[PDB]
């Protein structure tokens, strides 16, 4: 928080004079990993050897991916939220909005000079609107920045598991899952206070017959996360037996 | 011990016959992941894996590093102890000193028609004089030199750990940490015979405010594995209360 | 508390009115042992009884021990309390120090006509600064005439424990033990608001090499006796670390 | 052992330059009571009560009785064992036998510098052999210096069992009990190896009926407690079988 996080980010910005945006990311890589190996962590020294071959090869979406897992798990680590940030940003510039790239880097020098985990959450989300711009959906970008500027202001880690549901619905807007009106129904939803009726509304479209086993069993589940960590427990029961429905009936 | 052993280093002798000093060294992990892979051995085949691929991108250290986590908790695997001094020689030979590349390269040749552990443990005495004389300190070598001769004729597998212990010490003198005096009269300790005493005078200088929580903790749980490895349960007791004291108090 | 109490003091003005000063705590104790034999109080029956030899010996010293013991495991009985403020007030008296009894017969007299044990422990730190200053130090009563007012402000019984350990520093000062800079350094720290640092002094000075063995350990026992009856276990776990490194190691 | 028991004894020697021999002892006493009273040694401190008080009184036989209980039971403190050999050379003294007086005047001599309980044992023996020659018998005289003598180039406690053994024969012999062939007979028993030979002989007197149930009982329990010391199960087990067919039939 403000110490041995300042240095890496110094050095990724030498190592970016270049202007390679590559060759930095894999230094902070190995600064990470050096510093993780010799402890007897195993398990964060493997997933970087993941994450510096992926990032080498040009998947940063799976290297984003497994870090978002890895931070989710376990975010007492703040020099690999710090890398993770750096590789978001980055895969942010390829996908070709310059405008959040630049409000990670923000984000990226203000968690420098902090140590606040709501930070790698708003650049969490940032990267959400990025992925939906991309997706084709615009409408779905207005709620996810709604999200992005109350997280600045409340620091509840529960917000982005909101966001993941919204990109989640946007993917099957996407496929040819489950139609318009649906999601934005949900994601109206999602988006005033409703969270329990968005499990009636998934029940009762499945019951009429407008949405396949896979896609509500797959939105009730995040739905089931995002309620286990805001600690109630009349809306986990009421997703418990929205899903146990679903599936075997 | 003397078959088996022989082959491979035979074959790295004829495929580094050309000077590429990489390929055969890459050949050999390939000889042993597959001698480790046929059986039910996942954890060698992934950590091989790994070692090959860092070996393929040049940086060695992280290969040698877990490679002496494999062999120090699984010492049975004689392969993996072979192809592992062959890259602690060619990182020495990298690094730009002959004669310790040459004395590992005996200990390699000596080692392949035997099957003794201590060669092993030699090699990675000799590999850590290597990286204290690139640090800069030489002084200390003279103390690495006297534990690699004393272990060619005694064969206990805990010198290499005061080894690392003053290897340690070498990389907190040059960073900004603990100052020269301790470093110095901590080589002294360990070097005639004294291991209590570290503690001791380890504890004082945290009283007396001249070293940060953090080094005395991680010279206090190497002291503690040195004594792990020894038998000694007054010693293990006295680290305990040192390293119990040095936390919470 | 103001019944059954006043009786014995005035029983003791009267006999002491022809000024024997000896006959008159012996009818107290008769007194109070008739009281306490009318029931099935065995243990204390016994302890008054060798308080009435040792007094009619005229070894106070020990009585005024065994009673403080008494006192300290069972702080219920009043009347005992009472004989025991009277027994110091006569030892005082035979010590050559008029000041310290007058004020012990301003305590008994205000006790009397109260209740409250705190004028017990007040009268008990006041005979610790009669048997300073007859010791030979001067500079340690000062510390415990500001515990003396503390206490009459506060009614904290862990008072007492620290006037104790500094009559135990006074007493090590004088037969050969532990020098003065290590005894001035402990009362400054125990003055102000130091029993932490306590602890880290004395084994800074032991590891040094100033302090044998038993003083430390009966230094630390001491703080530890106080820091028991203070509720604090950041403190005890602290003083149980320190005395088992100083005895075994 | 040499050092803070040579003190008492010095001590005992300035006051005892006067030639009172009884105020002496009690400052002695006095010593070892603030000893044990600052501890938490409330059995040490009411026993040295009651010595004193014997003491001073003049029945020091009851004096040594208890305090040759309490060094058998715990025989590490030696201070007390000190206090105890000078109580007995005192009553030695007065009884009327210089000789005896001079050897465990010796025997304090030695015993202050140095710290063997052999000593102890020793000055105990010497006090048997003179309550034997007060009691009139002289023939037991003869094999009480044989263990003295045994005792001081052996060191084993055991010896000093037997001689008590001795001292109750003499006992019984006087008053009116047991006759006189029994007594030399057992008494040559103990004297050349024979502990099993004495259980059944006095059984076989038992039986034929020249022992009262009481005697022969006692001489039982003493042999079993001479049994008990010397680590010897078909001792045991022989003089179990022997009080249980004595007591109950
Ligand atoms: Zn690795
Ligand atoms: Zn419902
Ligand atoms: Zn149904
Ligand atoms: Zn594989
Ligand atoms: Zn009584
Ligand atoms: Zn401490
Ligand atoms: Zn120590
Ligand atoms: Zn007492
Ligand atoms: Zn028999």
Do not use: C, Q
């Not at 996908?95 to 985990?117: C, M, Q, W």
């Not at 896609?215 to 739905?223: D, G, P, Q, S, T």
């Amino acid at each position: 928080g403000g110490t041995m996080l300042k240095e890496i980010l110094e050095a990724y910005k030498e190592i970016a004079r270049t202007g390679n945006e590559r060759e930095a990311l894999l230094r902070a890589i190995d600064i990470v990993r050096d510093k993780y190996s010799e402890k007897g962590d195993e398990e964060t020294d493997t997933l970087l050897h993941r994450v510096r071959l992926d990032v080498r090869e040009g998947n940063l979406e799976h290297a984003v991916e497994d870090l978002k897992k890895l931070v989710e798990k376990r975010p007492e680590l703040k020099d690999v939220a710090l890398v993770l940030i750096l590789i978001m940003a980055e895969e942010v510039k390829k996908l070709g909005f310059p405008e959040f790239a630049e409000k990670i880097e923000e984000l990226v020098e203000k968690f420098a000079e902090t140590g606040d985990i709501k930070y790698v959450y708003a650049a969490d989300i940032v990267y959400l609107m990025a992925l939906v711009k991309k997706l084709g959906d615009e409408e779905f970008v207005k709620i996810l920045e709604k999200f992005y500027e109350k997280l600045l202001e409340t620091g509840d880690p529960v917000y982005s598991l909101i966001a993941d549901v919204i990109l989640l619905l946007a993917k099957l807007l996407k496929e040819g899952e489950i139609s318009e009106e649906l999601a934005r129904e949900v994601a109206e939803l999602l988006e005033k206070g409703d969270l329990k009726g968005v499990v009636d509304t998934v029940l009762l479209y499945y019951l009429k017959g407008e949405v396949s086993k896979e896609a509500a069993v797959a939105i009730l589940e995040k739905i089931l996360k995002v309620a286990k960590a805001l600690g109630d427990e009349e809306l986990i029961k009421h997703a418990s037996l929205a899903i146990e429905h679903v599936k075997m009936d």
